Design an enzyme around this catalytic site. Structure first.
Site: not given
Ligand SMILES: NC(=O)c1ccc[n+]([C@@H]2O[C@H](COP(=O)([O-])OP(=O)(O)OC[C@H]3O[C@@H](n4cnc5c(N)ncnc54)[C@H](O)[C@@H]3O)[C@@H](O)[C@H]2O)c1
Ligand SMILES: NC(=O)c1ccc[n+]([C@@H]2O[C@H](COP(=O)([O-])OP(=O)(O)OC[C@H]3O[C@@H](n4cnc5c(N)ncnc54)[C@H](O)[C@@H]3O)[C@@H](O)[C@H]2O)c1
Lengths: 365, 365
Positions: A122, A144, A186, A228, A238, A242, A246, A249, A253, A266
């Site tokens: 929890r 988030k 972003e 942010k 949100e 907030r 998006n 987005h 999505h 993404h």
């Molecule tokens: N929570 C939030 O507020 C928020 C905001 C934006 C995005 N997101 C989410 O986060 C994700 C964003 O994806 P992402 O771009 O982080 O992709 P990801 O986590 O898939 O990473 C991108 C790729 O690069 C590799 N990688 C990561 N770090 C590395 C490094 N230092 N060196 C070499 N390779 C590396 C990873 O293994 C992966 O293959 C999405 O799922 C999205 O929905 C969330």
């Protein structure tokens, strides 16, 4: 080490930014308030940074012990079954409420780790160590967390803040070019929604960022985090504001769920989503030709897509948009641009024919 | 309609208590803040109460459309796989952030629906309609939601607060004696932990509660919800004081997991475990023997077990207790009676010989 703080009262926390911060063991240790730690990372990141990260938490700290779970790499594993491995590991090791989870990787890991942390017993303390541009300007900040369902993106999760966020820009050194560019999506978003001077600075500095200049990347991260953090402090859960984060987005999505998880990064989906939401904005008469051109130019500078995949149909968009979390009472509120650059609206009151044109103009089928 | 509040500032909410409350549509509809509702219930409860609750949610209420999801009945099913049925249904019917979940059942449904609500789209509203004594006196109140893991009880969940709690005392009319009795374990618990006068009251009133006297039952509920509401408001997330509600539950959760989820009722597991906790409290010389045998006797008047199941071992108790949520940095803290009737401590300081002396007294091996 720079610090952008996120003020949520008693739940405020710091975002540390700089080079070699993974070699400053004091930073992490300060936010580990128990004996035991669970590092969550993936199969790509682990060989690069895990030893370094356990090193930073333990080898100069004797009363801290560290365990890991290596999950498979990919957006397509952003699901309940891959999350269950984290709970399974944590309970097999008999970790307790005083343990700390550490998200080591991109946004996929941050989101999965954060939600696991929210839910395990929890809730237990967790820390973000983003290693992508995306995660360093967006995902690691804000609390988030969660997973995708097969019918949609981020439909299960939690609002849950980390204890800190540790951004070390050196980690970008191992990141492929394609992952780099996709994080800039972003960064551009911050410009369009609320930050015209940030946007302007990007129009000038995008070549630097693309060349991975340290100072440029560090400011884009800092200034992204300032935006942010401001929004999250004002609107954590949100209620209203907030949702501005998006922009592009709702469409993006729809590109991700539709085009099958993982094929497009993404940020690449958001690049294209943003163009679509700019186009709709123009069609509604809410914005100028000039914003359209500048939005299109800057994403082109970042070698990001400015239209969706040619297999995306109008129906897929509508069907996935139907489960967007900006729906309220069966009504699809959108994030659209309105007025001079850096201005946007959160609204469910837009002419639906404009939306329909936009879909039909961008979709081959 | 008797009301007992829960005080968490802008997250405060009422617990309504009385007969025929399901016949007052007003009460449910007040707390449904959107156009959509999903009633989560189970296959035993559905064909007795679903119609009525759908009827109350919609009467004089065009604005609201109501769906339901039917879960399998059993503690066995209080796990993540089954919970997917809630998410899948929700997403399939395109429920949005403004929907409301109605948890319609005992504590299994409450915890599950609670945690589903906490997580669906990172949190939608939910409302509690408890139909077992256990639920009406304990589980429905406090916003402790979640699910079991194989290796232990309630190890995944969230602190999520319902919009309101609707105890309709008539729903106990369909509940079997066994289920009814098992509910009385938590009523006693409140006596022993912090409410000596309530305890004395139960000692007079137990035969009345076992005979389903409307007055006694109703007052038990009110008094039980008053205690819990007081504890929850002070310590919602369990920094300290809330843990006192877990008297006999460290042993209890070990029986559940040890002997198989749903082989005994929660209440039955809790009863035995309370009796073990008092034994350990006496062995410590923290408690007078009157409290020991007064406890034993009230439970027997409720026809509750005063021993764990014959196949429980010492090893089983120890290995399950190791993942109790009262464990902090590897230290198992327990709720033990010290002092006059109605007083308690939550402590990491006790003689472990007392602990496995009490384990060897109660287990055949
Ligand atoms: N929570 C939030 O507020 C928020 C905001 C934006 C995005 N997101 C989410 O986060 C994700 C964003 O994806 P992402 O771009 O982080 O992709 P990801 O986590 O898939 O990473 C991108 C790729 O690069 C590799 N990688 C990561 N770090 C590395 C490094 N230092 N060196 C070499 N390779 C590396 C990873 O293994 C992966 O293959 C999405 O799922 C999205 O929905 C969330
Ligand atoms: N969240 C909390 O703070 C909290 C507190 C105490 C207990 N709990 C949890 O609640 C659960 C206890 O559940 P429970 O004892 O209510 O059992 P339960 O939820 O399994 O339901 C009891 C049985 O009676 C049936 N039933 C329920 N209502 C009925 C009615 N009106 N008529 C006929 N049959 C009915 C159910 O279908 C089931 O077969 C445990 O899992 C426990 O951990 C939670």
């Amino acid at each position: 080490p720079t610090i952008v703080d996120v003020d949520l009262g008693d739940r405020s926390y710091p975002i540390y930014i700089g080079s070699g911060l993974l070699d400053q063991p004091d930073l992490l240790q300060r936010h580990v308030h128990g004996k035991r730690v669970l590092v969550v990372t993936n199969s790509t990141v682990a060989p690069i940074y895990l030893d370094k990260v356990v090193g930073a938490l333990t080898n100069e700290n004797p009363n801290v012990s560290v365990e890991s779970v290596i999950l498979p790499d990919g957006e397509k594993y952003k699901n309940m079954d891959t999350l269950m491995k984290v709970f399974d590991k944590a309970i097999e090791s008999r970790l307790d409420r005083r343990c700390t989870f550490v998200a080591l990787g991109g946004g996929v890991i941050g989101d999965m780790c954060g939600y696991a942390a929210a839910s395990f017993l929890r809730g237990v303390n967790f820390i973000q160590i983003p290693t992508t541009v995306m995660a360093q300007v967006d995902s690691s900040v804000g609390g988030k967390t969660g997973i995708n369902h097969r019918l949609g993106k981020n439909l299960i999760g939690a609002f849950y803040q980390p204890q800190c966020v540790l951004i070390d820009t050196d980690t970008l050194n191992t990141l492929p070019d394609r992952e780099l560019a996709s994080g800039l999506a972003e960064v551009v978003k911050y410009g369009l929604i609320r930050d015209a001077n940030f946007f302007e600075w990007q129009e000038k500095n995008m070549p630097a960022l693309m060349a991975r200049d340290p100072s440029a990347l560090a400011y884009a991260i800092k200034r992204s985090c300032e935006n942010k953090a401001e929004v999250v402090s004002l609107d954590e859960k949100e209620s209203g504001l907030r949702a501005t984060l998006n922009l592009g987005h709702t469409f993006g999505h729809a590109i991700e769920t539709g085009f099958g998880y993982g094929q497009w990064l993404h940020g690449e989906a958001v690049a294209a989503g943003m163009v679509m939401a700019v186009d709709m904005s123009y069609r509604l008469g809410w914005i100028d030709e000039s914003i359209v051109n500048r939005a299109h130019n800057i994403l082109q500078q970042a070698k990001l897509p400015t239209a969706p995949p040619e297999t995306m149909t109008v129906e897929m968009f509508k069907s996935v948009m139907a489960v967007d979390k900006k729906v309220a009472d069966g009504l699809l509120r959108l994030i659209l641009l309105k007025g001079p650059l850096g201005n946007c609206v959160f609204t469910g009151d837009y002419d639906r024919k404009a939306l329909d044109e936009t879909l039909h103009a961008f979709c081959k089928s």
